[PDB]
Amino acid sequence: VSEANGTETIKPPPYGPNPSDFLSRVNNFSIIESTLREGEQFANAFFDTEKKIQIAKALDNFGVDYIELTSPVASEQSRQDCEAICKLGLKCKILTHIRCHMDDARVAVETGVDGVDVVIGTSQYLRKYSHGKDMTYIIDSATEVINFVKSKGIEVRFSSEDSFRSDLVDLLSLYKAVDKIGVNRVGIADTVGCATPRQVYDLIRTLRGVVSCDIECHFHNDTGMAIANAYCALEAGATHIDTSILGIGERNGITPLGALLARMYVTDREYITHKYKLNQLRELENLVADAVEVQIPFNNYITGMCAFTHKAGIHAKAILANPSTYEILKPEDFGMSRYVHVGSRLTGWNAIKSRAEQLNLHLTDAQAKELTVRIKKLADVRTLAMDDVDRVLREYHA
């Protein structure tokens, strides 16, 4: 039934793609996985060679196109680890992260890397007036590094620290200069964690117009924008995004690998599910979690205890449609069996059983008991946490 408090319907004035969409890289981009560089800055990371090798092997199998390693001049161990990893015959390309110096580059090339991701310092380029023109130059010695690396057949990308806090006149002029010389890629880094998504879109879109090469983005997560900035970077034409497993890095870290893949999955399911072995993500996160001794957060994307939960009960009635209507991520696409519908809270073995069934761990009668004994001995110490269920199950595989 109706009365005269309605309004004329707002209709728009044929539809197709906007010119912008053509530049978008949302279903066609590369991850540069940086667990073995930026991740080494994580407060509790102390990877030894064996552990670096396992992480590299597992990243390669997972499907990433590049892995980035700590500068081989950081330390002798670092140099050796870089050599070792370059000899495993991975399919993905191997990059190393270096300052813009000749010695750093020689050593990088010696170790066998496929490319050097270079950071240029603000002293390695100046503006000057020359024959009545405002001119930006990359200084002689710094230009030499690019040419050397190119001559030895190796990929080069050049970036600047703290890109969102630099003067745009300097920053864009530098990237145009580097582009005239010729690199594979330039990089943008929100080192400080202050960039906002529209700010990112606007900058990358402009960079895309200034240079002709590829564009890499590196986003810190101090203020919760790292996944959102990666996404807007992609919409604007960025071709490569730096990630880290569980985002581990300096302070609270960077764009988390799993989080990014969750976002990109929703945008294009076939693309992501075929490129990456998604069912391997738990096992990939657990490996790092174990090494850096952290627990997987209860609300971790995809793989946290609660990511695939629906509330059953009086509180489900707050949403109007069936709660199963709202399932943007399909658990099977990530190796899981279902959304778990939670009414009562499950203590003890009931909690293990549920989560284990969800994770596709076909457990023994014998394993059920070992686990139950271990959770009792844990609760004897203090109250359990949702987090503990994933922790006791860490050593178990689908």
Ligand X SMILES: O=C(O)CCC(=O)C(=O)O
| Enzyme catalytic residues | 315
Task: Decide which of its own copies, ligand X, Zn ion, none touches 263; Cβ closer than 5 to 8 Å per partner kind.
Answer: its own copies
If one asks whether residue 32 binds ligand X (CB under 6 A), the answer comes out as: no
Identity of the residue, 16 or 89, whose beta carbon is nearer to its own copies in the bound complex: 16
Q: State how far the alpha carbon of 249 is from the alpha carbons of 286, 321, 335, in Å.
A: 16, 40, 27
Q: How many residues sit in the footprint of ligand X (CB under 6 A)? A: 12
Task: Decide which of ligand X, Zn ion, its own copies, none touches 176; Cβ closer than 5 to 8 Å per partner kind.
Answer: its own copies
Task: Decide which of Zn ion, ligand X, its own copies, none touches 159; Cβ closer than 5 to 8 Å per partner kind.
Answer: ligand X
Closest separation between CB of residue 311 and Zn ion, Å?
A: 11
Q: Where are the beta strands (DSSP E) in 141-289?
A: 155-160, 185-190, 214-219, 240-243
- Is residue 93 within 8 A of residue 65, CB to CB? The reply is yes
- Is residue 375 within 8 A of residue 384, CB to CB? The reply is yes
If one asks whether residue 59 binds ligand X (CB under 6 A), the answer comes out as: no
Identity of the residue, 164 or 173, whose beta carbon is nearer to Zn ion in the bound complex: 164
Identity of the residue, 38 or 81, whose beta carbon is nearer to Zn ion in the bound complex: 38
Q: What are phi and psi of 326, to 5 degrees?
A: -105, 75
- Strands 309-311, 340-342: pairing kind: parallel
If one asks whether residue 289 binds ligand X (CB under 6 A), the answer comes out as: no
If one asks whether residue 38 binds ligand X (CB under 6 A), the answer comes out as: yes
If one asks whether residue 240 binds ligand X (CB under 6 A), the answer comes out as: no
How many Cβ atoms from other residues are within 10 Å of residue 136's Cβ?
A: 18
Identity of the residue, 157 or 355, whose beta carbon is nearer to ligand X in the bound complex: 157
- Contacts of 362 by beta carbon, 8 Å cutoff, 6+ apart: 398
If one asks whether residue 119 binds ligand X (CB under 6 A), the answer comes out as: yes
- Contacts of 322 by beta carbon, 8 Å cutoff, 6+ apart: none
Side-chain-side CA neighbours of 346 within 13 Å: the count stands at 19
Task: Decide which of its own copies, ligand X, Zn ion, none touches 228; Cβ closer than 5 to 8 Å per partner kind.
Answer: its own copies
CA angle, corner 47, sides to 46 and 49, nearest 5? 145
Question: For residue 30, what is the DSSP state?
Answer: E
- Is residue 97 within 8 A of residue 39, CB to CB? The reply is no
Identity of the residue, 33 or 117, whose beta carbon is nearer to ligand X in the bound complex: 117
- Contacts of 300 by beta carbon, 8 Å cutoff, 6+ apart: 246, 258, 285, 307
Task: Decide which of Zn ion, its own copies, ligand X, none touches 117; Cβ closer than 5 to 8 Å per partner kind.
Answer: ligand X
Closest separation between CB of residue 91 and its own copies, Å?
A: 26
Residues in contact with ligand X, shown as a per-residue x/- string from 175 to 194 under the rule CB under 6 A: ------------x-x-x---
Cα–chain center distance at 281: 12
Determine if residue 287 is left, alpha or beta; phi over 0 gives left, psi from -120 to 50 gives alpha, anything else beta: alpha
Give the whole-angstrom CA distance, residue 192 versus residue 251. Answer: 10
Task: Decide which of Zn ion, its own copies, ligand X, none touches 248; Cβ closer than 5 to 8 Å per partner kind.
Answer: its own copies
Q: Annotated binding residues for L-lysine, as ranges?
A: 38, 117, 191
Identity of the residue, 318 or 366, whose beta carbon is nearer to Zn ion in the bound complex: 318
Q: What Rg value do the Cα atoms of the chain yield, rounded? A: 24
If one asks whether residue 35 binds ligand X (CB under 6 A), the answer comes out as: no
- Is residue 217 within 8 A of residue 230, CB to CB? The reply is yes
Six token digits for residue 33: 């996985």
Closest separation between CB of residue 53 and ligand X, Å?
A: 23
Give the whole-angstrom CA distance, residue 170 versus residue 192. Answer: 18
- Is residue 149 within 8 A of residue 135, CB to CB? The reply is no
If one asks whether residue 40 binds ligand X (CB under 6 A), the answer comes out as: no
**Footprint of ligand X on 64-83 (CB under 6 A):** none
If one asks whether residue 220 binds ligand X (CB under 6 A), the answer comes out as: yes
Task: Decide which of ligand X, its own copies, Zn ion, none touches 187; Cβ closer than 5 to 8 Å per partner kind.
Answer: ligand X
Specify the stretch interacting with Zn ion by CB under 5 A; choose among 35-43, 172-180, 350-358, 374-382: 35-43
Closest separation between CB of residue 71 and ligand X, Å?
A: 10
Closest separation between CB of residue 55 and ligand X, Å?
A: 18
Contacts with ligand X, residue ranges (CB under 6 A): 38, 97, 117, 119, 159, 161, 187, 189, 191, 218, 220, 319
Contact residues toward Zn ion (CB under 5 A) are 38
